[PDB]
Amino acid sequence: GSFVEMVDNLRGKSGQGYYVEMTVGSPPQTLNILVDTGSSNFAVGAAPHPFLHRYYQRQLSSTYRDLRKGVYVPYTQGKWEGELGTDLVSIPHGPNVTVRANIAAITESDKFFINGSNWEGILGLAYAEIARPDDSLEPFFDSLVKQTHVPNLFSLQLCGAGFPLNQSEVLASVGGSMIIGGIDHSLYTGSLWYTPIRREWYYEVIIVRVEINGQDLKMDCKEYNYDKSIVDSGTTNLRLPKKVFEAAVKSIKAASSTEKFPDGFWLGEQLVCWQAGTTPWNIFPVISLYLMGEVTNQSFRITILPQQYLRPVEDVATSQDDCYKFAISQSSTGTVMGAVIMEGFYVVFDRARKRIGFAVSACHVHDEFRTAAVEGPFVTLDMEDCGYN
Ligand SMILES: CC(C)C[C@H](NC(=O)[C@@H]1CC(=O)NCCCCCCOC(=O)N[C@@H](C(C)C)C(=O)N1)[C@@H](O)C[C@@H](C)C(=O)N[C@H](C(=O)NCc1ccccc1)C(C)C
Numbered sequence: 001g002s003f004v005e006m007v008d009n010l011r012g013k014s015g016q017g018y019y020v021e022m023t024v025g026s027p028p029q030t031l032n033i034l035v036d037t038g039s040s041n042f043a044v045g046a047a048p049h050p051f052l053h054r055y056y057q058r059q060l061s062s063t064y065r066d067l068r069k070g071v072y073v074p075y076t077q078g079k080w081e082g083e084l085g086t087d088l089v090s091i092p093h094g095p096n097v098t099v100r101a102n103i104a105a106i107t108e109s110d111k112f113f114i115n116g117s118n119w120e121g122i123l124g125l126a127y128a129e130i131a132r133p134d135d136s137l138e139p140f141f142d143s144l145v146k147q148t149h150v151p152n153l154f155s156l157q158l159c160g161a162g163f164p165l166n167q168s169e170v171l172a173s174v175g176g177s178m179i180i181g182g183i184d185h186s187l188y189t190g191s192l193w194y195t196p197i198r199r200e201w202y203y204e205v206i207i208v209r210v211e212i213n214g215q216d217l218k219m220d221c222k223e224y225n226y227d228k229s230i231v232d233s234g235t236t237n238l239r240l241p242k243k244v245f246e247a248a249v250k251s252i253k254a255a256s257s258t259e260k261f262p263d264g265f266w267l268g269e270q271l272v273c274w275q276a277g278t279t280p281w282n283i284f285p286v287i288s289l290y291l292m293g294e295v296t297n298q299s300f301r302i303t304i305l306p307q308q309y310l311r312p313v314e315d316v317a318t319s320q321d322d323c324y325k326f327a328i329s330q331s332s333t334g335t336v337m338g339a340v341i342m343e344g345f346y347v348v349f350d351r352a353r354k355r356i357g358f359a360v361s362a363c364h365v366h367d368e369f370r371t372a373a374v375e376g377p378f379v380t381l382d383m384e385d386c387g388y389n
Helices: 140-147 167-171 242-255 339-343
Strands: 010-013 017-024 030-036 042-045 065-075 078-090 098-110 121-124 154-158 176-180 188-196 207-212 229-231 238-241 272-274 287-292 299-304 310-313 322-326 328-331 335-337 345-350 355-361 373-378
Touching: 010 167, 010 176, 017 121, 017 176, 030 042, 042 078, 065 098, 098 140, 154 339, 154 355, 188 287, 188 345, 188 373, 207 242, 207 299, 238 242, 242 328, 299 339, 339 345, 355 373
Parallel strands: 030 121, 042 098, 229 335, 238 328
Antiparallel strands: 010 017, 017 030, 017 078, 042 121, 065 078, 078 098, 154 176, 154 345, 188 355, 207 287, 238 335, 272 322, 287 299, 299 373, 310 322, 345 355
């Protein structure tokens, strides 16, 4: 019904990511672990580093176990190298349990640890399939479901402040909430629609239709799923395949033509500024992603406002304007429904019934004229075709 215990246990923003607190080893070594549903490794910093305020100190853990096996790991933008082992892990603000899970002690890394982010590790919530080195390194959530009773399911509620926050605010703020082994009704409104999980590797879903201000982008759906479509809390923007992305931008551009912006902006690089609280939320279009449903020939949709795709950043010269960056970029690796999009809903990663939940988050940013949404059902056909093989 509601797990008040775990509510608000997240912290951060779509920028650097939303992390949760965990203790590694004996005695407990508190560490803020970045919540990433797009990976499967549990890797914490295990050495001193420019951007780490504290790290994993095996020499001091009485239960640390060496596996004399290393691990290299590349990321769409980054990569770390570490030494595989095991230790006792616990989630302070989570189910009351202690589980032994594989911990990849990051000993060397390039462009991975974000400066200021405030998290020293990453929790790969995905499936073995994508784990490194091989699919035999039992992801953490599995160890958890195997060693305890905790239902095999977790939900996510990421909250974007809607405005830029300073490192002080981040710390003393409620990024979001990750409910371990349950669904807390207080985090969402409306019904909760479900889309099937294609293959249990990444958290893969299938998109069947895409609209901009209601105008069907009208593309062969496969293109939307080109390569694959995933729900990855570790990615910030809404990554879209070139052919699509390009169509999307042509639309978003056209719908906001009353105002023109530099190419830089549309290419997610530079920001756009507006006088304090005068941002034209209304001249920008809403994006509606149609996801496959569980009932044959039936689909539902999620709709986001520009308060989701226009990412808040600090003023060019930290003043009084309100600025953002277009947060939709092309992807050579398919579609990535990242942090932003997620910020618009309460997602139930129900691994058990192999399906992902989507509800309107009780904490998504909006105005009094438009609200995000999860509406359904819709009679569409041959959606299995939208799939990519
Ligand atoms: C802390 C951070 C480094 C975590 C990773 N995030 C990333 O790599 C994200 C992906 C993305 O599209 N974000 C959209 C916002 C763009 C903003 C503009 C700036 O973006 C950037 O240039 N870089 C970063 C930011 C955070 C600094 C970033 O955003 N990269 C994580 O999500 C990793 C995922 C995406 C990943 O790549 N997982 C592996 C994978 O899928 N690998 C496939 C592969 C195999 C062989 C070669 C290449 C890839 C898996 C095995 C663990």
